[PDB]
Write a protein that binds this DNA or RNA. Sequence first.
RNA 1: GAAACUGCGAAUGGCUCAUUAAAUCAGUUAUCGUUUAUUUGAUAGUUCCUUUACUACAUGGUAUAACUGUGGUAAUUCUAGA
RNA 2: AUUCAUAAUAACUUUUCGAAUCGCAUGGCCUUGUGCUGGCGAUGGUUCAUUCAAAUUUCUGCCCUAUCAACUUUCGAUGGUAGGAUAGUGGCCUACCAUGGUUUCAACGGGUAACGGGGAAUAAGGGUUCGAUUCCGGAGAGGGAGCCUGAGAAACGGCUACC
Lengths: 226, 134, 260
Amino acid sequence: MKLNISYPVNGSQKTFEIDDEHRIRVFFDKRIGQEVDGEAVGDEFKGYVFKISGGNDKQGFPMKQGVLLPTRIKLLLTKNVSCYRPRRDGERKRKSVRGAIVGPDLAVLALVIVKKGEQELEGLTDTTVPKRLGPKRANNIRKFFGLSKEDDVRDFVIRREVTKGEKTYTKAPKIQRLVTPQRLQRKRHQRALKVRNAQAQREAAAEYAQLLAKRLSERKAEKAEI
Amino acid sequence: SDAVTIRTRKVISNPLLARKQFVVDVLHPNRANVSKDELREKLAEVYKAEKDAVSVFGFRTQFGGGKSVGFGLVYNSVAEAKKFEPTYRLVRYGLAEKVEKASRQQRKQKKNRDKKIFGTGKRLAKKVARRNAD
Amino acid sequence: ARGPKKHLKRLAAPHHWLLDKLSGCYAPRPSAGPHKLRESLPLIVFLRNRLKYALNGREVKAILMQRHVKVDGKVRTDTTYPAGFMDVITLDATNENFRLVYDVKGRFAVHRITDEEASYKLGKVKKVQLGKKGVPYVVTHDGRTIRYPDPNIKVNDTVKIDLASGKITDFIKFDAGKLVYVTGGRNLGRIGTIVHKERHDGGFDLVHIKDSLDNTFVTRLNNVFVIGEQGKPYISLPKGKGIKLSIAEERDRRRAQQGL
RNA sequence: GAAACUGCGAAUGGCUCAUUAAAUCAGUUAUCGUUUAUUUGAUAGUUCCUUUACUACAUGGUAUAACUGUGGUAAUUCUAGA
RNA sequence: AUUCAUAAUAACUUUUCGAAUCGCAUGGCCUUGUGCUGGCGAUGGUUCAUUCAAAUUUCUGCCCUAUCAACUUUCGAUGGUAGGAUAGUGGCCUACCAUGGUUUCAACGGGUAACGGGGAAUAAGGGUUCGAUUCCGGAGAGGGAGCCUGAGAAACGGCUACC
Ligand SMILES: [Mg+2]
Ligand SMILES: [Mg+2]
Ligand SMILES: [Mg+2]
Ligand SMILES: [Mg+2]
Ligand SMILES: [Mg+2]
Ligand SMILES: [Mg+2]
Ligand SMILES: [Mg+2]
Ligand SMILES: [Mg+2]
Ligand SMILES: [Mg+2]
Ligand SMILES: [Mg+2]
Ligand SMILES: [Mg+2]
Ligand SMILES: [Mg+2]
Ligand SMILES: [Mg+2]
C-alpha cells in the first residue's frame, strides 16, 4: 500500500509502502482536501498533519475531487478538468473515475503535509528541491525582490551557468512586458496614426462640404434664372 | 568533324529569375543524343556564362534520329543558379548531393509513432525502464 | 457541402484561362479578392502560361515572394491572387507594365503599356450609398470603396482611379454614343458605342452597342463597361480593338499575313 | 531549434450510389427574407460607475502547459498528486 | 418598389469594440535628456462593402403501374392573427380561430433489377436504349438519433447513447 506524501514548502516527494491495514483505517472513509492526523499511520509521524490530495486505485483509475462515492463511476469530461486531456478543441469523452472517498480499493494515496512533525524524514524534509527557474516578467521579478517602482531590472535577473565540456556560458530569460524605447516608439506611433487619420478625415469632410456648397449655388442659379 | 551544331531557339530574357530561357535543338548526323554535360559545356561557351550556371532538360530524340529538341537555361550567375534551380537538377549536375533520407513509409510510421507521445517522452521511457525491472 | 470549397478541378476552370486539358487533375483556384472567380485571371496563370516567365508553380512562387510582381500598385505575393479586368500588373524587372484587358476572342490578352498610363486604372461604379456618419462612397468592379465621390457619379459610370492613392481623378457618365467595352456574355471583348439603352423595369437592362464597322449587338448592362466617349479611349486598347472579324475574313487576313 | 502553450487548418480532397420519383437535379429566377471565417477596399481623437470619488500608462494582476520530481493500471495517443 | 441607406431625439445593456502585440532600420531635433518627434512592415480589432460561399426560394420539366380513385385533416392537413424559435422568410413550433388543400390535365398509393444532369450506344429522318463511373449538383460514412468546437458539421480517419 503505497503513499505518495509530499512537502510543498520544500517541494519533495516520497513513497511509503504501509502494511497492517488497521494503520490505514484512519484514512478510510475520508474525502479529498480534508486533513488526517499522522498519529495512527506512522510511529515517526508524530505531530504530522496530512491533507488528502488525491491518488489512484487498483486498475489505475485516478480519484476525482467532488464525487462523493466510495466506488468508481463513469463521468463525461469536458476541458479544464482533471483525469482528461482533450485531443480536439471542444472534444468531450466519458472516462471512469474513482470517487473521492478513501477506501480499501485504493492502490495508492497522494498526501500533502500541511504541518511538520516532531521528527525528520529520510528524504522529504531534509532535502530542499531547487527551483527550476525564476520569474520572467519584469514586475514578477520586481515583486520577487521588492526593489522599487522605478528601478532597473537589467542587472537583477537570476542567471544560470551552463557548461559544455570546455566552454562555460551564462544564460538568462528574456524579460517580457519590459519598458523599452521600441515599445514607446510603437505606442506613440499608434496615437500619432489615430490623430493623423482624424485630421485627414476632417479635411476630406471640409473639402466635400465646400463642393456641396458650390454645387448648391450652381443649381439655385439656373433654377431661379430659367 | 561530325557537326553537332547545337542550335538555340525561342530565347527569352527572364530577369525575374535572372536567367535566359530558350529551346535547344541539336542537329547531330551519325550520332545518338550526344549528351547533357557536353551540351552544357557548348552552351557554356556560346553564352560565356559558366558551366555550373547552365541547366538543360527535355531533349526528345526525333524519330529516325539525327535531331533532338529540348529546353535550356543559362543563369546570370552561379550564385543565383543554386537558388532558383530545383534540387534534383543540381544533383544531376553534381552541384548538390541527393539527401539519403529515410524512406517515405518509415518517415510516416515514425511520425505516427511520435504522435502517441505527449511531450519529450523522457519520463515515460524512464517509467517503463523502472517498472519492467523493479 | 459542409463548407467552402478549396479545390478547383481541371475542366471546371474558366475556359478563357486556356489551361491545357491534360497534365494535371486540378486547376489553380483563385483566392478571395477583388474579382470574381469566373471573371479573374490568377497570377500563376498570368506568369506561367500567358507570359511563360515561369515553367511551373514553384517558379511562380519564387518570382512572387521577391516583390517582383505588383497588382494595382501593391505586390500581392499570393500565388492564386485573383487579378481581373482592368488591373494593372507591374513587373519591376523588364520594365513592363500590363493592364488586363480581354482580346476580341474573349480571353485575357497580354497588353504591354507604359508607366504613365499604368499609374491609374478605371472602375465601373457598382453602388453609390451613404455610409456611417452620412459619408457617401462608391464601390467599383474590383471591390474598392472610395469615400466622398462626386455627387454626379452614379451607378454604371466609370471613375478614373488614382491607383497611387484611393482617389478619383475623373468620371465618365453612362450615356448614349460613348465608347464602351463588353466584359461578359458571348460578345465579351468587343468595343463599340452606345446606340441607346432600354430599361425593362424590374430587371435586366439591355444595351445596344455599335462598333467601328457598323456592326450592332445587344448585351446585358452587367457586361457593359464605359471607357470613354466616341474616340480617344481613356486606356490603351489591345490589338484588334474589338471589331469581331468573322471566321471568313479572319481566314483571309491570316492567309495574307503568313503567305508573305 | 526539440517539446509544449498560442494561432490556423482538420467542414477541402478522396470514395460510394444505399436512400431519394416535384424529392434530388437541369435551365431560369429572388433574398426589399438571411448568415458569411479568409481575401480585397474603406473605416474608430469622444475609453470620467452619476467629473466638480479616474486608477501605474516609462505599461495591472494571477495561473498554467512544456520542464523538475513522486507514482497507479495487465493493457489505451489513460493520467494523478508536488 | 420599401418603415431602404443614412441622420436626429429619449433612454437601455451580466456594455461589444475603441492596439498593455511583434520585426527591421534605428533617423531627425534642441532644455544633450538614455528628453521630444519619426519610416517600412507583420499580427490583431469594430463596422460597411467585396470575394469565397451558404441557406432559403420562383417557373417549367422525370420511368412503369387504376388487379392504386380518391387522398390529407386525432397527433398541422390549407389559411388568418399573435407569439416563440431560427441567421433569417415560412404551420418551422405553440395558442386561438376559420374549413380548408390536392385530384381522371392521373392526386394518393405501389414498383423501380431509380442518385439527377452534362452525356453514351445506335440510327436516312423521326425515334429506341443506357448514364454506378474522369465534370457539375445531392446524399452517406454498419443502422438510427443526439451534440461539442468552430465562420462553416448535425462531421463520424470528432464525441455521447442505443442496436
Ligand atoms: Mg487557391
Ligand atoms: Mg467533399
Ligand atoms: Mg487563413
Ligand atoms: Mg410569424
Ligand atoms: Mg400562421
Ligand atoms: Mg438504388
Ligand atoms: Mg450518375
Ligand atoms: Mg447499384
Ligand atoms: Mg456526411
Ligand atoms: Mg462496411
Ligand atoms: Mg455522423
Ligand atoms: Mg474512415
Ligand atoms: Mg473522410
